[PDB]
Amino acid sequence: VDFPRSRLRFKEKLGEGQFGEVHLCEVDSPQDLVSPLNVRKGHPLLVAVKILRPDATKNARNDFLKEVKIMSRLKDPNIIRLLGVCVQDDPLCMITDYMENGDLNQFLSAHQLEDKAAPTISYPMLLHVAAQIASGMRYLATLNFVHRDLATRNCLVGENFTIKIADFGMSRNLYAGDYYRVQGRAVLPIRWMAWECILMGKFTTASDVWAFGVTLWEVLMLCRAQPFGQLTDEQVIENAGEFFRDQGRQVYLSRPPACPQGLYELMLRCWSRESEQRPPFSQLHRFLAEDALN
Numbered sequence: 001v002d003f004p005r006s007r008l009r010f011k012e013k014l015g016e017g018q019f020g021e022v023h024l025c026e027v028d029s030p031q032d033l034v035s036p037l038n039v040r041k042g043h044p045l046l047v048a049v050k051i052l053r054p055d056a057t058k059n060a061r062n063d064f065l066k067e068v069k070i071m072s073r074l075k076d077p078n079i080i081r082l083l084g085v086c087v088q089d090d091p092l093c094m095i096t097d098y099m100e101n102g103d104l105n106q107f108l109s110a111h112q113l114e115d116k117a118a119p120t121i122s123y124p125m126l127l128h129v130a131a132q133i134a135s136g137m138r139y140l141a142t143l144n145f146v147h148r149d150l151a152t153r154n155c156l157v158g159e160n161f162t163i164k165i166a167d168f169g170m171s172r173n174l175y176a177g178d179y180y181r182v183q184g185r186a187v188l189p190i191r192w193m194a195w196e197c198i199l200m201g202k203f204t205t206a207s208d209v210w211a212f213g214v215t216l217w218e219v220l221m222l223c224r225a226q227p228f229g230q231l232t233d234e235q236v237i238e239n240a241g242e243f244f245r246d247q248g249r250q251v252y253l254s255r256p257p258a259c260p261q262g263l264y265e266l267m268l269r270c271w272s273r274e275s276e277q278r279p280p281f282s283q284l285h286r287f288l289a290e291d292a293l294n
């Protein structure tokens with residue numbers, strides 16, 4: 001059942017993509033449509049809508065139709081959700097919740113750790129942000145779904161520090177420095193990648209755990225610094241080789257200022273050479289949710 005396209009009212013542009021756009025839209029007369037949405041009375045219902053340009057290539061339309069298939073199965077509080085589609089006619093549309101605070105890298109960058117002595121954020125809230133990401137990945141693991149590009153730039157933030165995992169792709173200018181590009185090869189977020197992904201292209205739930213470790217390091221750094229930021233792309237790839245050789249010469253991300261040694265030891269577990277020794281997301285969530293409880 002197509003969402004009624006006529007009820008979508010443009011407001012502003014959230015994203016310029018290569019073959020489409022993401023727009024912020026209001027939903028005209030929202031009460032008629034509620035079954036999958038929830039709207040407070042007398043307030044504007046805002047949604048994000050990904051629209052395929054109606055003259056986009058056949059390749060682009062194919063990729064869009066597959067993304068609809070993938071999005072359709074995602075049903076978890078910490079993964080973005082498909083509210084509806086308009087695909088029986090053109091332009092093809094997907095609809096999702098509006099997350100008013102944008103991506104998590106930009107959001108956290110504007111905050112400082114609160115000073116007990118005295119926009120800020122507390123240590124327990126940082127853990128709450130991290131645990132929501134772990135819960136989202138826990139869900140994806142039960143689907144045997146491998147993300148392949150977990151990073152704070154790919155998470156969205158709503159009200160009250162709620163987090164949802166997304167996947168923007170790798171084309172945004174703002175994050176060009178986070179990807180390694182070689183002609184004729186896949187574009188690769190090497191600073192977030194397990195050693196076996198870099199050397200063999202093997203992406204698994206276990207390499208998603210490695211990437212979660214880096215993502216947790218980002219959060220505890222308040223997104224103030226790039227992983228391995230003082231090293232070149234070449235040195236990061238060479239480091240992957242040192243994990244393989246296993247002669248004690250591989251290096252790790254350092255402990256953030258806001259990060260206690262216990263939590264750092266969890267990050268190091270996420271970066272275990274052997275993929276089967278890395279913790280499952282069910283245990284990562286538990287650790288982080290306990291600590292954030294008090």
Ligand SMILES: O=C(c1ccc2[nH]ncc2c1)N1CCC2(CC1)C(=O)N(Cc1nc(C3CC3)no1)CN2c1ccccc1
Pocket residue numbers: 014015022048049050074079080094095096097098099100102103147156165166167168169
């Ligand atoms: O530009 C934005 C954006 C910016 C600011 C915003 N604030 N509030 C909302 C919002 C949206 N994007 C984020 C959402 C987006 C398009 C890019 C996306 O990363 N998609 C692919 C995807 N795959 C997965 C699976 C791994 C879980 N999750 O997402 C699909 N997806 C999307 C967007 C709109 C409707 C339907 C899908």
